[PDB]
């Protein structure tokens, strides 16, 4: 089966988002939703909607059952970043990078 | 036609027993280190352990010549400033008789992981008996 759901340009750093990605890798979608619902991380709130969107795609486009699915693949890739200017002391100027990421979640009933 | 090489899963190891009962320390240790390495077998290869098992029974009766019984010193450092410590041959024989033979053999072996495996096959005891009767060692002269 192995149906997917992607979120492009999520406004969070990839290194921050990968801490939550490997907390749900390989788990059943039933207990993966409980972990994300009660986590204190911001990336867990973002990644929860990608996981529920994948489940909805499974039920509608493929006629699956939520009790049968499990998180088969999850990864976080880097996106494009905004560049800003930070004034420092004595006329010095710094460059600020605001990073983003792509999140892909796949659920499979096998 | 390539040169034969010994495989660690096929080597044949044997047990011998050596008695230090008036033996020169350094001349006894050169034969032990030769057996521990495998130089006495045609199947010797530099990178596998093809040695034998050596048991030494009368460790405390090993002998030295000249005036080395009092003038031979063993030094070690503890890692702290001023932590140099020394002991001579008489006090070490009374305190730890086996450490004399082990120290002499260890310095005649390669200093690498393979050379520490050859050292693991040397058993030194201070009495007249050993606990390795199940392995059935056999006599070895010098």
């Amino acid at each position: 089966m192995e149906v997917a759901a992607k979120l492009s340009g999520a406004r969070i750093s990839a290194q921050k988002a990968r801490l939550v990605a490997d907390q749900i890798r390989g788990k059943k979608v039933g207990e993966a939703l409980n972990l994300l619902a009660f986590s204190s991380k911001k990336a867990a709130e973002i990644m929860k909607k990608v996981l529920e969107s994948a489940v909805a795609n499974a039920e509608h486009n493929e006629g699956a059952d939520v009790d049968d699915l499990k998180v088969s693949t999850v990864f976080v890739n880097e996106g494009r970043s905004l560049k800003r200017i930070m004034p420092r002391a004595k006329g010095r100027a710094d460059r600020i990078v605001k990073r983003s990421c792509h999140i892909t979640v796949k659920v499979a009933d096998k | 036609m390539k040169t034969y090489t010994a495989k660690p899963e096929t080597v044949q190891r044997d047990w011998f027993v050596v008695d230090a009962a008036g033996q020169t320390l350094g001349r006894l240790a050169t034969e032990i280190a030769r057996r521990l390495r495998g130089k006495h077998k045609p199947e010797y290869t530099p990178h596998v352990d093809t040695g034998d098992y050596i048991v030494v029974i009368n460790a405390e009766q090993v002998r030295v010549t000249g005036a080395k019984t009092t003038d031979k010193m063993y030094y070690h450092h503890s890692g702290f400033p001023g932590g140099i410590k020394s002991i001579n041959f008489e006090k070490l024989i009374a305190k730890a008789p086996e450490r004399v033979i082990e120290t002499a053999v260890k310095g005649m072996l390669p200093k690498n992981p393979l050379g520490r495996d050859m050292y693991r096959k040397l058993k030194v005891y201070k009495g007249a008996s050993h606990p390795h009767t199940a392995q059935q060692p056999q006599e070895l002269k010098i």
């Binding site: 801490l19 939550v20 907390q23 409980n34 972990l35 619902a37 009660f38 986590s39 991380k41 | -």
Partner: protein
């Protein structure tokens, strides 16, 4: 003070071998069947089999 050499890929990944996250203790309220944090009031408003705040 700053590095005289830049860290390798392996060197900075061994430092991050302690950055993993732990899970929370979750319980199921048998009266309702709802998942909540252990020793906490459920999002509905139940604790130990009683209504406390009722939204």
């Amino acid at each position: 003070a700053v590095q005289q050499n830049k860290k390798s890929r392996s060197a900075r990944d061994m430092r991050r071998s302690h950055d993993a996250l732990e899970s929370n203790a979750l319980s199921v309220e048998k009266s309702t069947g709802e998942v909540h944090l252990r020793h906490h009031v459920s999002p509905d408003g139940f604790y130990r089999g009683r209504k406390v705040v009722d939204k």
